[PDB]
Amino acid sequence: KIPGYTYGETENRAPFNLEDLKLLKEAVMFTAEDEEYIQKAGEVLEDQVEEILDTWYGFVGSHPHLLYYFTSPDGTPNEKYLAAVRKRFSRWILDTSNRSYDQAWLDYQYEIGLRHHRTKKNQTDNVESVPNIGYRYLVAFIYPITATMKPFLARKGHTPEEVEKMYQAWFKATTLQVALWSYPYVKYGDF
Amino acid sequence: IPGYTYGETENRAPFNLEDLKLLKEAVMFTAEDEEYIQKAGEVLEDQVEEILDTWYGFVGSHPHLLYYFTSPDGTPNEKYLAAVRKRFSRWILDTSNRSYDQAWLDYQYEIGLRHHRTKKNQTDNVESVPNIGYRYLVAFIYPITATMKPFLARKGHTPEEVEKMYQAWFKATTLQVALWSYPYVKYGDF
Ligand code: HEM
Ligand code: HEM
Ligand SMILES: [C-]#N
Ligand SMILES: [C-]#N
């Protein structure tokens, strides 16, 4: 077991439902075509996750105000916090590509939003760190997530057209998830 | 353009140029993107009517999106759509041509306020739904980029150049929706 990873065992139901998920998928233009290519993206990314993790956390680590969210109160990075989260982020890459986007998935999406938010941040790993990740950065991060995935998607010799489809699927699926994560941040009734 | 008040908003944004610098860093937006978004402008400018049809065609294709433009009777308000269309058209140019300075930031606060319940329906003085749910503003980052993509290639630029214009557009669209979140986000959580 991955420490802290509680997919399918959240014991709180998400405040958004499967119909909400359907309508949100429509808003990010996500169809059965993207179901085919997000799973293909998984097949491509799964063997490269160590270098993907290094690239992603290298980006976070290169900006003081982003690495900030993993720091101890004294301003120094908490490497145990970073390492524990890294294992769950690694799993998230596989989940995004491999899970059915069903109620169990939606319950975990609510959980992931809660963990970035002050509601549950720092509780999973029992660490002491900054209390909230400003929402502005969750949205911002849609971009660098997609930009870090893009080069890796080419590395199994899929055609340019297939790589482009895998990248677009990833983009849709990343946007969809960050939308859902906004829930605990948004003024009640405005989501 | 009716309702377009860029430069003359009379609220200062609650985020500042330092906040903008840090958020640009989070979406990997640099001077290179400033150059390529300007080029994207040059490419898109004379294609705006097709862009608009493609964009509002998508909104109009799903009842739960077209909803945000509807009158109480559930039918689209055509006055509202028409007036917004002109400002959206201008936004394509503003995104490409404006310096992302304080006046830009102030208008980004305003655009967020106008999607949000705070100022929605007020600019055009229409009776419509009170709030655009935030979930959709984030969602719409994707369709904005997928709408621009094919037009970015229509003036003969190489795939390498189209990709730079496209990535710049993506970054700049994500940056703006991040700022538009402000009025939606619980105080202290942004
Ligand atoms: C597209 C946006 C983002 C994605 C896809 C993403 C992905 C993830 C994932 C998959 C996890 C682990 C979830 C789990 O516990 O199973 C996580 C946790 C975490 N992420 Fe992100 N994240 C994003 C935004 C951000 C931002 C902007 C930061 C700021 C540095 C950040 C820093 C963290 C931190 C500090 C945790 C640990 C939260 C906790 O205490 O539980 N994330 N992220
Ligand atoms: C990336 C996301 C989005 C972008 C780039 C965008 C762009 C714009 C722009 C440029 C305007 C005019 C702003 C001005 O007054 O100068 C506007 C207004 C408007 N948009 Fe969006 N928009 C987005 C999300 C959405 C969504 C999800 C909807 C839902 C259908 C929507 C529906 C509307 C409506 C109803 C108005 C008029 C609001 C008012 O009463 O002033 N927009 N949008
Ligand atoms: C988050 N990583
Ligand atoms: C907005 N359109």
Author numbering:
A (entry chain B): 5 to 195
B (entry chain A): 6 to 195
Report text from the authors:
Thus, in Pgb the access of diatomic ligands, such as O2, CO, and NO, to the haem is granted by two orthogonal apolar tunnels that reach the haem distal region from entry sites at the B/G and B/E helix interfaces.
High-resolution data (1.60 Å) on the MaPgb*(III)-cyanide crystals were collected at the ESRF synchrotron facility (ESRF, Grenoble, France), and the structure was refined to a final R-factor and R-free of 17.5% and 23.8%, respectively. The rotation of the Phe(93)E11 side chain allows the rotation of the Trp(60)B9 side chain of ∼90° towards the center of the haem distal site. As a consequence, in the MaPgb*(III)-cyanide complex: (i) tunnel 1 is hindered by the Trp(60)B9 side chain, and (ii) the Trp(60)B9 Nε1 atom is at H-bond distance to the haem-Fe(III)-bound cyanide ligand. Interestingly, the 149–154 region, which faces Trp(60)B9 side chain on one side and the second subunit of the dimer on the other, is significantly divergent in its Cα-backbone relative to the ligand-free MaPgb*(III) and MaPgb*(II)-O2 structures (maximum displacement at Ala(151)G13 of 1.75 Å and 1.64 Å, respectively), and shows signs of structural heterogeneity, with Ile(149)G11 and Thr(152)G14 adopting two alternate conformations. Cyanide binding causes also a shift of about 1 Å of the Tyr(61)B10 backbone toward the interior of the haem distal site, with the concomitant side chain rotation of ∼90° around the Cβ-Cγ bond.
